[PDB]
Amino acid sequence: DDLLTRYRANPAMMKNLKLSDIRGALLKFAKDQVGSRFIQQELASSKDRFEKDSIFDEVVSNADELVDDIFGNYVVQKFFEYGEERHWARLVDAIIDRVPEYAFQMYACRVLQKALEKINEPLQIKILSQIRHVIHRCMKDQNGNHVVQKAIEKVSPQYVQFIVDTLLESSNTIYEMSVDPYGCRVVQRCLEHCSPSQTKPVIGQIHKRFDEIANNQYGNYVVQHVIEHGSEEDRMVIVTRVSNNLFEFATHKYSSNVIEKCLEQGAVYHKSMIVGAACHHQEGSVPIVVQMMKDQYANYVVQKMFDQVTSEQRRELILTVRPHIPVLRQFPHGKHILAKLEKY
RNA sequence: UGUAUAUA
């Protein structure tokens, strides 16, 4: 008979198990799927604040074994959730040596994010100082990107300055990160949480390779974030570049959502640019918008246009489209959205 | 009719 074995077989014990009852058996309970679930329930439900201190020192001394365990990491997280600063400082001091490794570990990175989510700034910088040694590799790792995201999300901009320095360290880093499946999220968090003096260099690097980023499966989300969290001059430059090349940007899988973001977030003169190019620029002897309506992707942009655009700019679209309606009805995407646009 | 977002 063993306390863990007895609890798994009969959780509803005659004397209901508390955390102080598993004293000396923390590691066995924490590494068990059912046992860890018990600690999570009591750490979240027990009104006796002193009950969690009976196992806490066992959690600290075995933190190097629990933070990267398939079940033990939930126990460590709950002490950041329901513990206080005295609990945080001891947990951080216990895991700080292998933070350069925990950031890349599937379960251990969850603990690091929860810590940055809950703890105070001095303890946040403690974890942040250990990320400095692996920041470049950590930024585009399958697990480490979520650690870098939470740091940008939860600590002051002047403390993530070394991350912005890493993104600008080389001429191509911003592009590589923008087209990376994990690194593109670090660029996104920076675009909405960093200071203007940090975002302005990064945004300027996005404009240096705007065309390659805008049609990238991940970089298009980066361009969309510059549209939403950028300055007035940033949307202007973006809306001019997409309007200068509307057809190719609307007829491609990923860059088509960029023009929808321009239409969703743009001012009147921004949409006037998009409408003017769609109506008055040609794609094979016929207006851009007419060829857009028979395209598999650009028809969504025409839908987005007609719904987000001024009624007067909508009249310019209607007059441009009307004489081409018999031509469009012969195309499957043309007849499809002509039906959804029969409203006009 | 068309895009990313991780643990039992």
Author numbering: 174 to 517
Sentences from the paper on this structure:
PUF proteins, named for PUM (Pumilio) and FBF (fem-3 binding factor), are an exemplary system for understanding the divergence of RNA recognition within eukaryotic RNA-binding protein families. Eight PUM repeats are arranged in a crescent shape with the RNA bound on the concave face of the protein. Each repeat contributes a trio of amino acid residues, termed a tripartite recognition motif (TRM), that directly contact the opposing RNA base. FBF recognizes a 9-nt motif, 5´-UGURNNAUA-3´, whereas PUF-8 binds an 8-nt sequence, 5´-UGUANAUA-3´.
To clarify the molecular basis of this divergent binding specificity, we determined a 2.6 Å crystal structure of PUF-8 bound to an 8-nt PBE RNA, 5´-UGUAUAUA-3´. The overall structure of the RNA-binding domain of PUF-8 is similar to that of other classical PUF proteins with eight α-helical PUM repeats (R1 to R8) and flanking regions at both the N- and C-termini (R1´ and R8´). The 5´-UGUA and AUA-3´ base specific interactions bracket a central region in which the 5th base turns away from the concave RNA-binding surface and stacks directly with the 4th base. R362 in R5 is located at the position that typically would form stacking interactions between the 4th and 5th RNA bases, but instead the side chain is moved aside. The mode of RNA recognition and overall curvature of PUF-8 are reminiscent of the one repeat to one base modularity of PUM1. Aligning repeats R5-R8 illustrates that the curvature of the PUF-8 scaffold contrasts starkly with the flatter FBF-2 scaffold.
